Amino acid sequence: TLTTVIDIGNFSTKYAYKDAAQIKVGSFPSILHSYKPLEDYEGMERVEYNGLDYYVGETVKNFYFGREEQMYFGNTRKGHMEGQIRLVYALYTIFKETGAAEFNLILTCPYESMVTDKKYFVQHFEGEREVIVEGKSFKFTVHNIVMAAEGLGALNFSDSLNCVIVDAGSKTLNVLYLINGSISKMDSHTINGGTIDNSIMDLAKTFAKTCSNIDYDYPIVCTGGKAEEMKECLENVGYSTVSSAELGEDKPSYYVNSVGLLLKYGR
Amino acid sequence: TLTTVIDIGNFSTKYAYKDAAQIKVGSFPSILHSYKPLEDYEGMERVEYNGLDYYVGETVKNFYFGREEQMYFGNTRKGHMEGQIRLVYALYTIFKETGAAEFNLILTCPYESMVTDKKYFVQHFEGEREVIVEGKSFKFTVHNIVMAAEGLGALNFSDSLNCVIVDAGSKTLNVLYLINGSISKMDSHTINGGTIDNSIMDLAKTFAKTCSNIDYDYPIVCTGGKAEEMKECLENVGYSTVSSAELGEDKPSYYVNSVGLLLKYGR
Amino acid sequence: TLTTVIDIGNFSTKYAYKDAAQIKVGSFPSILHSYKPLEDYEGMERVEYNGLDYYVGETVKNFYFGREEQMYFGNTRKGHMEGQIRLVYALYTIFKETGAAEFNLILTCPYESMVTDKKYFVQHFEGEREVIVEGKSFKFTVHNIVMAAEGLGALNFSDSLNCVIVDAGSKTLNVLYLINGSISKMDSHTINGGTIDNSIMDLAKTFAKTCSNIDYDYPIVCTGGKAEEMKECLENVGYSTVSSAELGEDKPSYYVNSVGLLLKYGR
Amino acid sequence: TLTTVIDIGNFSTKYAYKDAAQIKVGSFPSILHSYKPLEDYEGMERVEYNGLDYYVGETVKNFYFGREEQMYFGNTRKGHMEGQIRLVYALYTIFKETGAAEFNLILTCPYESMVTDKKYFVQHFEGEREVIVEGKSFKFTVHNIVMAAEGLGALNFSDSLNCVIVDAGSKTLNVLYLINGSISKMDSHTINGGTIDNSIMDLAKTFAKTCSNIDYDYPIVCTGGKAEEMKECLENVGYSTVSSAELGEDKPSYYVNSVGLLLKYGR
Amino acid sequence: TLTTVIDIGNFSTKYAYKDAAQIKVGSFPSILHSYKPLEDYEGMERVEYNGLDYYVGETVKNFYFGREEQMYFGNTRKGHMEGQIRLVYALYTIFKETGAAEFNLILTCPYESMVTDKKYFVQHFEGEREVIVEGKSFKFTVHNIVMAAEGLGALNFSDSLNCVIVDAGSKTLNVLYLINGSISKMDSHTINGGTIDNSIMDLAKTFAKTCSNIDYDYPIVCTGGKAEEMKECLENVGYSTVSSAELGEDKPSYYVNSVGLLLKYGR
Ligand SMILES: Nc1ncnc2c1ncn2[C@@H]1O[C@H](COP(=O)(O)OP(=O)(O)O)[C@@H](O)[C@H]1O
Ligand SMILES: Nc1ncnc2c1ncn2[C@@H]1O[C@H](COP(=O)(O)OP(=O)(O)O)[C@@H](O)[C@H]1O
Ligand SMILES: Nc1ncnc2c1ncn2[C@@H]1O[C@H](COP(=O)(O)OP(=O)(O)O)[C@@H](O)[C@H]1O
C-alpha cells in the first residue's frame, strides 16, 4: 500500500510518493480536451473514468492552437465531471513507475474549499475503482483520502513556525496565514488571478493590499512554481524576511506544495 | 509660487493651501488601478506620470466590485512606483482651482520613515516635471520639498505643549509622543492596523498596551478621520484629558493633519 | 468551600489556596487575545465568560510575533471587559487541581483603586456564574469577595511592623507606606512604569525621588517578581535596612503578594 | 586659575566665584533626566560626562508633566552616577562666563557626610577631565577640592560667633550647632524633609523638637532659599534672637550658603 | 462639677481628680503627630479641637520610627496651637472614667511663665467648648482655671516648710526655691535639659552650679519621674538633707506634681 500526495493544479498536476528513503516525484501538464477520435496520436493518452473520455498528455495543447487562452481550468472547484481525470491519470502514472494498486491519497485543496470538496473526492473514490487508459483497463484501490491544504508543503522549509505562506499559483494565490503550525481561518485569503494571466510585479502588489495586516519584519514563505521570482518582487515592495522554499537536489520549485506534505503529514 | 501641504493617506489624499487669508482645502479618494482601456468613463480620470498609467478618481472603486479588500494601499511606504500618482494628481487638482504651476510641497510621512523617504520624494521631483492627465499634458514645478511628520497638524489645536498625538488613521496608528513642540524618537510608535480593518474599540485598546508609559492625566490629542470617535473610546479605557482636534467651519476631522501643518510650518 | 487569593497582574496571574496544611500555588501568563478561529491550537485555551471569547494560555504570545510590545495590559484598571477572563480562568485552573466550585475570593488591587474597583468585581460576580472553557461549560460560585491591597503579602516576611513595601511590579510600582500593620494613605505612591519597560537601576532611582521622606535606616520590604534584584539596586542608592521577602521551599519571589495574604488574611 | 564654590542642592545648583573685587554668581535648576533623543530642544542642554548622557537645563521639567513629584533628587548622597552632571555643568557655565579651565572647587556637603563623600568627589575629579556639552567637547582641570559644610556661608552674616545655623533647604534641614567658629558634632542635626514637601510652619515646629537644647535667647541664623520666611515662623514658635542672613545687592537668599563661603574660606 | 489637676508635661500628661475620699489618677504619653489618614489604627485616638487634627495615644510613637528624637515637645511654652490637644484629651479621659462635663482646671506651668500663659489657657477655654474624639463629638465646660506652679505638689510631702523643690523633669529642671510655703522669685531657676537628653549624674551636677547659694544642710525635695534616682545622685554631690517625695500606695513618683496640688490647693 503506497501513500502518495497528488497536488492537482491548473498548469500542471504534481504527484509525490516515497518508495525507498528517497522521494520519487513527477508531474504532467493539466490540459485535457474532449475525445474527438483521432487517427494516430503520439504524445497524449486517452483516459476513461466514470463516463468520461478525455485526452491527457503533453500534446493536448495542439487542440488549442489559435485559442491558447482556453487550455487551462480557471479557478474552478477541483474534482468536477472534468477534474477527476487529472487525478486518476496521476494514479496511473504512479502505477507505471512502481506497480502499486492500493493508494492512500493525500489530496491538496484551497483552504476555503476544505469541507466543501468532500462531496466530489470522497463519494467517487471508495476503493476498487477502474480506469481505461489507452484501451488497457486498470483497476486501483483508494480506501482513505486525507484532504490537506494547498500551501502547507512549504512549512517544512520555513525557519519560523509563525509565518505567511504565499502560494504563487497559476490561476490563484493562496495566502495562508499561519500561527503555530496551525492555519488561521480569518486571515487566510484566496486571491484570484495567477502567474499565467498576471505578471508577478502586478501580482505581488495585490498581495500587499489584501494581506496588509502584516508588518515588514514578519516571515513570508513563497511557494509555487514562480516562488524564486515571487520573493524577488516582494522585496521591492518592502518585505524583509521573505524566503522562498527550496527543495533538495534536482527538484524544482513547483514540487514544494507536494513534497513538503509528504515530509510532514500522512501518518 | 504656491506653498501647499499634501497629506497622502490610504483612504484618501488631502491637500491644503492658502491663497487668500482663508484656507482652501479638498481631497480625493486614494484608490487607483492599472490602465485597462475602457470605453467611456465618467467619474475617474487617467493619470500618466513617469512611465505609469493609472486611473484616479471617485469611480475607480467600481474596478474592485467583488474584491473590495483590494482597493486600499496597505501600510506601504508612500511614494512607490504607484504612490507618486496620488501626489501628482493632487498637484493637478490644485491647478484646476488656482492656476499655479510652481509648488512648495509640504509632504507628510510617518516619523519612522522620515529620513528614508528622501530616495523617492526628492529624486523624482526636481522641478519642470510633466503629467498627462486625461490626454491634456500638464507641466508643473517643485523646487523644494519639506517632509513633515504625520500628526503634527493636530499640535496647533492642542491646549498643552506637552502631549501625545494619536493619529487614528486608516491602515496605521501614528502615536507621536511630544515634549516641547518636539518629537521624542524613542516613545513614538507606529501601530499597524487602522480604522478600516479594525474597530475603534479594538484599536483604542491596543493604544493602551503600547503607549503604557502614559498616566491617565496626560494630554492626548486625537487626530485623523475617526478622531471624535477615537476620544469617545479612549475615555472608556480610562484616559481623562483627551481632546480631539477640531478645525474651523465646514472642515471635518480628516483635514487636521493637513490644515494644521499649514498654520504652523512652511516658512 | 475553598478560600483562595488571586493576584491578577500584568505579566502573570498568580493564584494561591490552602487545601492541606501546605499551600498549593500556581500561575499562568497574563497574555490574552481576541478569538480568531484557529485550526488546531495546543498550548492555549479558549475562555468564554459574559459575552467574551478570548484565548488564555502559554502560546497566546505567538499572536504577537512582530509586535511584542502589544501583549501586556498596561497599568489599566483590573477587571475590565477584558480583565475578567484572567480571573475566571484562574478559577478554572483551581478546579482542575481540587474540584472546588465554591470560592471565597481574596482579590488584590492597588491601594489607590481600592474603593473604585467594586463596580466591576462585585457586580459581575454574585455566585452561580458560568464559564465555557475549551467547549466544556463550567459552573462556579463566588459569594464573598475580599479586595485586599497589592503588596500586603510581603508584610508577613517583614522583621519590622513599621516599614515600606516596594512592589517591583511589571507595569507599575506600588510603594505602600505602612505604620503599625496599617497602610498610610497620604504616603502610599503608585509609580507608573515597571520592570518590563524600565531597568531596575533606572526604576530604583525613581523610588528614591518619590518616597524621599524616608531616611536610610528605615525598613524597606521589596516584593514582586524582581524582588531580589530590587534590593541589590536599592543598596547602591544608599538604603541600609532593605530586605526582600523570601518564601518557603520551591516558591519563587513572584508569589509573595499572593502567598503572604493567605497566611495573614481571609478570616 | 579660578577658585569657585559650587553648592549642589536639590532644587537648584548654585555656583559662586570671584573674578574682580565683585562676586559674580548664578545658578541653574537641579532637574535632570535620561537622554531620550529628541527632535529640537530649546531650553535644555545635553551633558555627557563619564559614561552618562543627561539633559540639564530649564525645560527638563517638561519631561515630568503629570509626574511632577519625580523631578527632584531626594536627600540622596550628592555625587552619584547621576549627581556628577550637576557639578560638571556648573563648571561649564562658569567657562561660558569667564573662559577659565583650571578650577579650585569649594564643594558643599552636609556635615554628617563630610568624610564619606571623598570616595566620589575626589576620585572622579583629578584634573584634565573632559565633558561633552551640546556636542562641543570641553576640557577642564580640577587639582584640589575643599569639601566645606552646608551652612557655613551664613556665618559671615552672623552678629554672634556662637550661634545655630538653620539651613531651610529643599529636601532636608541642616541644623549646624556652632560654638566658636567651629562646628559641634554631637549637636548638629540633619532633619529630613524640606520646603518642597513640607510647609515652613510644619517645618519650623520640627526644628523646635529636635534642637530643644536651645534656650530662646540663643542666636539662630536662618539660611537657605526660604530664609526670610523661616525666621518669621520661628518667632511664632518663641525664639527671640533669630536673624536670617541677608546678602548684598541683587543677590537673593538662596546664595547665602555659597557666597558666604567665598567670603570666608578657600585660602 | 469636678475639680481636677492636669500636669501637662513633655514625656507624659498626668491628670488627677478626687471623686470619693480616694484620689483617682492616670496619665497618657505626650506624643502627638499630624493627621495623615490611616487605614485601621488600634492604640491611638484622633482628637479634633479648634481647627486641629492630631493623633494622641500609645502608638503615636510608631510614626517616629527612625526619627525618635522628634517625638517630644522640647521646652516649648505649653498651650500652643499643638499643646491644647494634650489638655482636651485629658478632659476626655476623665469623662471616660466618671461622666463629668463641668471641670475646674488646676493647670501646672513653670513659675517663670506664670503670668505669660494666660493668653493661651484662658482665652481658648471659656466653657461650653467641644472636641471631636474618634468621630464622636464631646462637649465639656471649664469656667475657672487656677494656674499653679510646676513643683508645688511635692510640698505636701516635705518635712520642712523651708526647702528647695527640684523638679527632675524630662526636658527641663524646675528648681523652685521656697521660704514659708511661698515661692521666692529671684532664686527659682528653670534649668534647660531634662532626663531624656541628659543623664542624671550630669544633670544633678548642673544643679550644684546654678543653685549654689545653698549650703549642704538645707532641705531639698526631689520630685518628677526620676525623683528617687535624683536624690541618689545629689547625695554623691554632697547634699545631706535631701528627700524625694513619696506618694501613697500604687502611685509612682511621676504623679507627685499632680497629686500633691490636689491635696493642697483648689479651694
Ligand atoms: N512540469 C513542469 N515543467 C516545467 N515547469 C513547470 C512544471 N510545472 C510547473 N511549472 C512551473 O510552475 C508554474 C506553475 O506553478 P504551479 O505551482 O505548478 O501551478 P499550480 O498551483 O497550478 O500547480 C509555471 O509557470 C511553470 O513555470
Ligand atoms: N473624503 C472623505 N469623505 C468622507 N469621509 C472621509 C473622507 N476621507 C476620510 N474620511 C474618513 O476618514 C477615515 C480614514 O481616515 P484618514 O485619516 O482619512 O486615513 P488616512 O490616514 O489614510 O488619510 C475613513 O474611515 C472615513 O470615514
Ligand atoms: N509564571 C511565571 N513563571 C516564571 N517567572 C515568572 C512568572 N510570573 C512572574 N515571573 C517573574 O516575575 C516577574 C514579573 O513580576 P510580577 O510580580 O509577576 O509582575 P506583576 O506585578 O505584573 O504580577 C517576571 O520578570 C518574571 O521573571
Ligand SMILES: Nc1ncnc2c1ncn2[C@@H]1O[C@H](COP(=O)(O)OP(=O)(O)O)[C@@H](O)[C@H]1O
Ligand atoms: N534659581 C532659583 N530661582 C528662584 N528661586 C530659587 C532658585 N533656587 C532656589 N530657589 C528658592 O530656594 C528654595 C530651595 O532652597 P535651596 O536652598 O535652593 O534648596 P537646596 O538646598 O536643594 O539648594 C526654593 O523653594 C526656591 O524658592
Ligand SMILES: Nc1ncnc2c1ncn2[C@@H]1O[C@H](COP(=O)(O)OP(=O)(O)O)[C@@H](O)[C@H]1O
Ligand atoms: N505614663 C508613664 N509611664 C511610665 N513612666 C513614666 C510615665 N510618665 C512619666 N514617667 C517617668 O517619668 C519620667 C519623666 O518625668 P516627668 O515628670 O513625667 O516629665 P514631665 O515633667 O515632662 O512630666 C520618664 O523618664 C519616665 O520614666
Ligand SMILES: [Mg+2]
Ligand atoms: Mg499548486
Ligand SMILES: [Mg+2]
Ligand atoms: Mg493620514
Ligand SMILES: [Mg+2]
Ligand atoms: Mg503584581
Ligand SMILES: [Mg+2]
Ligand atoms: Mg543647599
Ligand SMILES: [Mg+2]
Ligand atoms: Mg512635669
